[PDB]
Design a protein around this nucleic acid. Structure first.
Lengths: 134, 17
RNA sequence: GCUGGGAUGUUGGCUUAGAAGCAGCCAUCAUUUAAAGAGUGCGUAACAGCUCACCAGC
């Protein structure tokens, strides 16, 4: 199977999506129309697409919520992450905010308890150059 | 070496649809 | 050595023609796990397909 991140609303350039999926017998022209048809409701957002291809030259795709990395950036108020995480601090997040993002990405998190969901978020935060404030 | 749509330079890439 | 796991939270910030471990600098996270690398590698123009670490059995 193949997983990737395409921009909602635009799918057609040969260089990126062309070979990656084409090497698996994926009909690029049918994929682009399909993806651009459903994800038109959220045009402008970057999201992961799971495309299941089989022996038959047909496929199916599933849409997923935006990655935590993107949420943390928009939460802290930054467009670009830090080149050097524990070297250059760019943004900061508060405890209650960590819970907020954790609760939103909980249904897709591999954690069982909320405490575990909070910590996984904190992990990405410190590795992205975001200071955690209580 | 001789494909259709598929790389950034050598010489083909894509072109149908 | 042999039989099968070797994904998820993402394609970590991203840059080039392209970047989606195998280019590039800090990072190097946490899950949950039976146990499982923000990965030793071949390879395509990259992906891929594939390789060990580890595991379950032997």
């Amino acid at each position: 199977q193949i997983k990737l991140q395409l921009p909602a609303g635009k799918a057609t350039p040969a260089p990126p999506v062309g070979p990656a999926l084409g090497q698996h017998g994926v009909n690029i022209m049918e994929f682009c129309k399909r993806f651009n048809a459903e994800t038109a409701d959220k045009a402008g957002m970057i999201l992961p697409v799971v495309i299941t291809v089989y022996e038959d030259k047909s496929f199916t795709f599933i849409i997923k919520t935006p990655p935590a990395s993107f949420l943390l950036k928009k939460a802290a108020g930054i467009e670009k992450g830090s080149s050097e995480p524990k070297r250059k601090i760019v943004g900061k997040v508060t405890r209650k905010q960590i819970e907020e993002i954790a609760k939103t990405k909980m249904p897709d998190l591999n954690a069982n308890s909320l405490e575990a969901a909070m910590k996984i978020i904190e992990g990405t935060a410190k590795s992205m150059g975001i200071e955690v404030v209580d | 070496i001789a494909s259709a749509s598929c790389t950034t330079x050598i010489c083909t890439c894509s072109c149908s649809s």
